[PDB]
Amino acid sequence: MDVFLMIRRHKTTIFTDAKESSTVFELKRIVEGILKRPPDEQRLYKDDQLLDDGKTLGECGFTSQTARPQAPATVGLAFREALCIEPFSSPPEL
Amino acid sequence: ACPAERSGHVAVSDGRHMFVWGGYKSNDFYLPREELWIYNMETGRWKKINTEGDVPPSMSGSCAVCVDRVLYLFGGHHSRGNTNKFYMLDSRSTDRVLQWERIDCQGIPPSSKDKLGVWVYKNKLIFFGGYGYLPEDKVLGTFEFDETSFWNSSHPRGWNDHVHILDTETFTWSQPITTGKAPSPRAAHACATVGNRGFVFGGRYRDARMNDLHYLNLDTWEWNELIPQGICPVGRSWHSLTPVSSDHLFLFGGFTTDKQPLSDAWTYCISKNEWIQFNHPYTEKPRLWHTACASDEGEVIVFGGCANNLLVHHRAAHSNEILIFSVQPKSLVRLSLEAVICFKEMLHSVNQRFGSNNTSGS
Amino acid sequence: ACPAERSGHVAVSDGRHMFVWGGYKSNQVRGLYDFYLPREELWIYNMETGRWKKINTEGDVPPSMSGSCAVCVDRVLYLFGGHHSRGNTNKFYMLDVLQWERIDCQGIPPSSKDKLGVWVYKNKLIFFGGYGYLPLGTFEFDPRGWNDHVHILDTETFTWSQPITTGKAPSPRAAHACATVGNRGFVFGGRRMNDLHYLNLDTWEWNELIPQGICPVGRSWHSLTPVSSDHLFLFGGFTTDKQPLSDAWTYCISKNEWIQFNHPYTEKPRLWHTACASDEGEVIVFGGCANNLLVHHRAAHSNEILIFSVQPKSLVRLSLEAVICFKEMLANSWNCLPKHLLHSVNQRFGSNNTSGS
Amino acid sequence: MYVKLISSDGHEFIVKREHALTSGTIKAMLSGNEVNFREIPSHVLSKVCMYFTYKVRYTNSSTEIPEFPIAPEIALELLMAANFLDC
Amino acid sequence: MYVKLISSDGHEFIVKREHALTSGTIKAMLSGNEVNFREIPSHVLSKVCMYFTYKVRYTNSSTEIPEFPIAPEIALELLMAANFLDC
């Protein structure tokens, strides 16, 4: 099934789609076409853990019910470096 | 304020405003002829406007269209039988009381009838089918008497499969020469237009309602029957069929051969030639002889109709409820508009908001 | 087997059966229109067994509305007012395939209101308060506003009458609670207010009562049901700070004081719920909301039944539950059955000759 | 004021008149003292009298109402007696 | 083919070209590539990008439309941004 994600390096957010069965190595090649960096120079992360290249997206914890188009799952990206995702702006409270 | 409950009314829309006229309800009683009801689809509020001039008689089963904010009305059944008169009402007027105009069209009009369908193509209104008296003129097509009307009606009536063209530029009737197998004569069918294709679904003929799907090519005048592979909605009449995209038709409600009211919703994909059932919260509110209008925000707005078998008139459960089917993603402005209105206590379109807050004032 | 979750419904009672109609629910997807439950259905809850039966009603069925007012007199439902998708309504319906009956009463009917209260006397129906459009008493504006009218309807001859008010009438309000104990028509709360008033139904004289001691927090959308000839029961509500309420009170009428009531439903606050008194010393409350109702898309409507044990159950009910509990054991037992006792009981209640077949 | 309820086997139960009014049957028989029950044995009537004191004590009571124990071997007798006595 | 949309705080959002064309204003600027929104903050632009994915996904779906969540604190800003972008 389709999963919708955000790939955040530092302040660059990539909106993209993939399937549960797709490997995370294939996700790196999607970044390659956008940021011109081979997969061996990239490292993707979930909240805190590192994802092995052979594991599928669903195997890493990205099920279709959580990675929705209206609320995509966040995926951290680090180049070759410590992963650092800068937060977005803050809305003024009421 | 509040339009009264009705079935057999007409409802037309420009995508923003729904115009409601006519219909009937049980105490039989036809609703006032001079009232035009406008439902604002953004604000969800009703407005009443009175009309003048050649006001049509109060009727059920009339056929209406809205082309460029002009209302066109043909056919119907008033308290003294069926008619074939044609009316126009220009909603773009600034008159406090809009003026109905009955047009004496050129050419030979269709027979007096009601419960038919209409397609809107380039500068023409194309009418199909219906139920009523024998034609008063030579007409291309087939008429078939309703055998139950010989002993139970003041004059015999029946179904037709006629196709009639009303050219809106000159208001002239004509009949195209068609090819292919036309659908059988029918009434209470549903018509929907997508481009040059005029789809017709269901209806009643002789005995038993139907679920066949046909379309008439409005360029080649070639009839075509679509035989979808897979499941199909059950045979019905008094259903609504509304285009919701360039490739999808939306079907709701109706009346089975066994006289059962229907609350099922379906989507037909034109390219794929297949039906898919649509999940919605109105499973306990079946509707028949209702109307459906498509909104500019991906919604189909259903109004009027009856919840049960209205063939028993004294027990007919006529309605004035508005049923909203969300069939396409809304615009972000509309979604953000709803969000702001949803939180008025926490924060012009936001000012008008909606109507009838059942919670306010506690 | 169970009605859909709702708020703003009506629930009436004859002591053993609870009739539930109307109300509204929140749609799964966020939107700007409420979902009113079908007008065609009427739900009956049996307080002895705890199961529901749904009956579809024909006739002059009232539209699907919320905030209506209902009363059960001799198992005859009387319904007035409420609110639907088009606006408020002042139509009066009655209900004994069951048929609703829309009655054209003599006199002048009231305005279109909702969230009001009602009292029942000998054969008169007495309505008070509400909120709605412009048409005795006052009418404060918030185009709708709060109400003070005390319209009265005779069930014998169906005439709309208004009483001559003696004494200080209460302030305009809606979403108040009304309870009847003898010739006293009680009002409490609303707007969240805390005042306690009663109207002498015999002399038609308003009275203000000022309890001494600890009193319930001012609330709206509460429930007030009599549990005795000298006690009232208040549960739930909606504070001024909009904090949902899961507390229950018992108000002694003769001593004019308030006492808190303990129950196992402290984790299930309710607002805009209905409440009905059973013949076994219970208060049956159904429906309502636990979340904040002002935010419609975030509303959490409930379909649960909460039972408060305010008074001890009868010996008949206690013994029968013991029999139901030890069914298999007692089926292998035997006990004496004096004929005079059995015939006296069957003289009072009758005996069905077709059972077991 | 006290009243006396007499069982079939000749036991005399003297209870408070207010407590005895819990039973509608006893209330109607006293209205206008002793009450005779030719068909209710003492092992049943004594349990009924205990319900009288229990029902009155916990009517309009702030504290939670405790359970009334009913032995299975007397449940059917008690149910018939309670229905006859209307309590 | 992708597009880059920059918020007022320098955040860069990379979305599909087909998704960004949902906004008529974005369509006009691209047809006149990247677009810089010096007045739309990142917390609003991120919301807008997820609408782009949501609109394309569930268009012509023949299925019930799921909810698009909008927090009250972002509602006013989201309305103005949506009006500016014509989407």
Coordinates of C-alpha atoms in Angstrom, one line a residue, chain C residues 227-228 231 259 309-316 318-320 322-323 326 329-330 335-342 344-345 348-349, chain D residues 25 39-40 47-48 51 54-55 58-62 65 68 70-73 75-87:
Chain C
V227 CA -36.2 10.5 43.3
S228 CA -38.8 10.9 46.2
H231 CA -35.6 14.6 47.2
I259 CA -25.8 16.7 49.5
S309 CA -28.9 3.5 42.6
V310 CA -30.6 6.3 44.6
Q311 CA -33.1 4.2 46.5
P312 CA -33.2 0.6 47.6
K313 CA -34.8 -1.9 45.3
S314 CA -38.1 -3.7 46.1
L315 CA -38.1 -7.1 47.8
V316 CA -39.8 -8.5 44.7
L318 CA -34.3 -8.3 45.0
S319 CA -35.9 -11.8 45.3
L320 CA -36.4 -12.2 41.5
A322 CA -31.8 -14.0 43.4
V323 CA -34.0 -16.4 41.5
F326 CA -29.6 -19.3 41.0
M329 CA -29.7 -24.7 41.1
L330 CA -33.3 -23.9 41.8
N335 CA -40.6 -25.2 47.5
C336 CA -44.1 -24.9 48.9
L337 CA -46.5 -22.7 47.1
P338 CA -49.7 -21.9 49.1
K339 CA -52.6 -21.6 46.7
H340 CA -54.2 -18.6 48.6
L341 CA -51.0 -16.6 48.2
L342 CA -50.7 -17.5 44.5
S344 CA -54.2 -13.4 45.6
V345 CA -51.1 -12.4 43.5
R348 CA -53.8 -8.6 41.2
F349 CA -51.7 -9.2 38.1
Chain D
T25 CA -50.8 -4.9 51.6
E39 CA -49.8 -18.8 54.5
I40 CA -46.5 -17.2 55.3
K47 CA -36.7 -12.1 56.4
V48 CA -39.5 -9.7 55.3
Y51 CA -36.2 -5.9 54.6
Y54 CA -33.3 -2.2 55.6
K55 CA -35.6 -0.4 53.1
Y58 CA -31.4 3.3 53.3
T59 CA -34.3 5.3 51.7
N60 CA -33.0 8.8 50.9
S61 CA -29.6 7.8 52.2
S62 CA -26.4 9.6 51.3
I65 CA -26.9 1.1 49.7
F68 CA -29.6 -7.5 50.7
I70 CA -31.2 -13.7 49.9
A71 CA -30.5 -17.4 50.3
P72 CA -31.3 -19.4 47.2
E73 CA -33.4 -22.0 49.0
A75 CA -35.7 -17.0 47.0
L76 CA -38.9 -18.3 45.4
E77 CA -40.9 -18.3 48.7
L78 CA -39.6 -14.7 49.3
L79 CA -40.6 -13.6 45.8
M80 CA -44.1 -14.9 46.2
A81 CA -44.4 -13.4 49.7
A82 CA -43.0 -10.1 48.5
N83 CA -45.5 -10.0 45.6
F84 CA -48.4 -10.8 48.0
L85 CA -47.2 -8.2 50.5
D86 CA -46.4 -5.6 47.7
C87 CA -43.0 -4.5 48.8

